[PDB]
Amino acid sequence: TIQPGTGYNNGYFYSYWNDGHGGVTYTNGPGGQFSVNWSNSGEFVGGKGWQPGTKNKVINFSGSYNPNGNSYLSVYGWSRNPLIEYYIVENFGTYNPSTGATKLGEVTSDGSVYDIYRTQRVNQPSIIGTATFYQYWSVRRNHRSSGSVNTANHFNAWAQQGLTLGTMDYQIVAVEGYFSSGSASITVS
């Protein structure tokens, strides 16, 4: 299992972060593979992809995702100027991250309708330090742990709705958890 941080493994950018609570391990495997095992964790995010991402990447992912509690499996990334944290959520555990969020439309992509939302994080950690910034969400209605994500369909639908992205920073397939347990093994390409 590896130290929290970022870097490159077998051609892929990776990012692994946690809040120091304990109870989560992250491992890099061959190619685009990574695994996460967690048991009564704190908050964490780990996954593989690209730095920088693009606005027309077709991301493929496959494997297993078995959360027990609060967790997401998403295409996850950021833009700068404007600072935006975004998710294309393919599956989740006990909590739908759009709960209580304002719905900004729908988009159909890669075999499912997704509901679109915007939320705001206030004075929270970001790629540029503590900040207030928007989050954009596409939440897949039909949950899965393998498939293909045509990111352009999401980014274009967001743009149509007034949810504009700046310059892309990293873009990964991420397993996120908040004080939960689980296991996941995902291969990205």
Curated annotation (Swiss-Prot):
The keyword Hydrolase applies. Pathway: Glycan degradation; xylan degradation. One of its GO terms (biological process) is xylan catabolic process. Glycoside hydrolase involved in the hydrolysis of xylan, a major plant cell wall hemicellulose made up of 1,4-beta-linked D-xylopyranose residues. Catalyzes the endohydrolysis of the main-chain 1,4-beta-glycosidic bonds connecting the xylose subunits yielding various xylooligosaccharides and xylose. The catalysis proceeds by a double-displacement reaction mechanism with a putative covalent glycosyl-enzyme intermediate, with retention of the anomeric configuration. Produces xylobiose and xylose as the main degradation products. Induction: Induced by D-xylose, dependent on the cellulase and xylanase regulator xyr1. Repressed by glucose through negative regulation by the crabon catabolite repressor cre1. It is found in: Secreted. Belongs to the glycosyl hydrolase 11 (cellulase G) family. Substrate binds at residues 72, 76, 87, 121, 125, 135, 170. Transmembrane segments: none annotated. Optimum pH is 4.5-5.5. Stable from pH 3.0 to 8.5 at room temperature and from pH 4.0 to 7.5 at 40 degrees Celsius. GO terms for molecular function: endo-1,4-beta-xylanase activity. Residues 1-188 form the GH11 domain. It catalyses: Endohydrolysis of (1->4)-beta-D-xylosidic linkages in xylans. The keyword Transcription does not apply. Keywords: Carbohydrate metabolism, Glycoprotein, Glycosidase, Hydrolase, Polysaccharide degradation, Pyrrolidone carboxylic acid, Secreted, Signal, Xylan degradation. This is Endo-1,4-beta-xylanase 2. GO terms for cellular component: extracellular region. Glycans are attached at residues 37, 60. The active site is at residues 85, 176. Its EC number is 3.2.1.8. The chain holds residues 35 to 223 of 223 of the full protein.
